[PDB]
């Protein structure tokens, strides 16, 4: 028996165009172009789930290095000082304590000074 | 009242008429009627007739009151084209489109 394939096409195109919804020019409107944009977007989305973790880790270290040199220590010594006193606090939090509770960040720099 | 009036299958193109439309928007009917009198385009005569329609249209049927009438939502929409075959040199044929436009106007207050 014959199968008209008109209902199903638009179903699977509309799925894709709805993902491209937002893109500039044809990349939004036109299926052929959108399909590529949607896939490349996926590739990048996958690729940057990895880079998200790196970028933030740089960004924290920068904050900590800045915050330490206010108190008079370079990051490399500050981390080695913390690790030598078996301190387990990660970068993410150190970058938060750097910004927020500077009285608490000061005491970490003393805690690290011992070693 | 919103009081619409329009010309469908208007024999001038969309882009040419849409150029005149620009001169009438948020504008007082009395002021807009004058402009189109002293604008020199074919589309001016075309769009005037539709506006001058819309005012009588508005005053007779529903709204009354000619003084307070501002042209709100005038817009031109590309209508059904008509394909004619202009022959070119060396035996090749070219489909020239005799384009048309739908001209709507909304005269409210």
């Amino acid at each position: 028996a014959r199968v008209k394939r008109g209902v199903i096409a638009r179903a699977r195109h509309k799925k894709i165009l709805k993902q491209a919804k937002g893109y500039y020019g044809a990349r939004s409107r036109v299926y052929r172009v959108a399909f590529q944009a949607v896939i490349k977007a996926g590739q990048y989305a996958y690729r940057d789930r990895r880079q998200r973790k790196r970028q933030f880790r740089q960004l924290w270290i920068a904050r900590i290095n800045a915050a330490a040199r206010q108190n008079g220590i370079s990051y490399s010594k500050f981390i080695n000082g913390l690790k030598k006193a078996s301190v387990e606090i990660d970068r993410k939090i150190l970058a938060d304590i750097a910004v927020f509770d500077k009285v608490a960040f000061t005491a970490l720099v003393e805690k690290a000074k011992a070693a | 009242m919103e009081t619409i009036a329009k010309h469908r299958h208007a024999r001038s193109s969309a882009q040419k008429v849409r150029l005149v439309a620009d001169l009438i928007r948020g504008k007082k009917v009395s002021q807009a009627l004058d402009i189109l009198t002293y604008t020199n385009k074919k589309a001016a005569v075309l769009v005037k007739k539709v506006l001058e329609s819309a005012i009588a249209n508005a005053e007779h049927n529903d709204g009354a009151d000619i003084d307070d009438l501002k042209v709100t939502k005038i817009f031109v929409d590309e209508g059904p084209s008509m394909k004619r075959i202009m022959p070119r040199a060396k035996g090749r044929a070219d489909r020239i489109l005799k384009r048309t436009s739908h001209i709507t106007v909304v005269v409210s207050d």
Partner: protein, 55 residues
């Protein structure tokens, strides 16, 4: 001769920006009859500067 690959709605818009023809916004008023007309042109009935100069 010929395009490499097609322009957009945007560019085509950008180009057409200047095609917007200006209005008159400068209608005269004839002194005697009070009719509106183009400056330095006669009126449609047949006046210019408050004097009939046409059949």
């Amino acid at each position: 001769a010929v395009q490499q690959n097609k322009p957009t709605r945007s560019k085509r818009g950008m180009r057409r920006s200047h095609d917007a023809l200006t209005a008159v916004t400068s209608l005269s008023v004839d002194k005697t009859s009070g009719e509106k007309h183009l400056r330095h042109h006669i009126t449609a009935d047949g006046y210019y500067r408050g004097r009939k100069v046409i059949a």
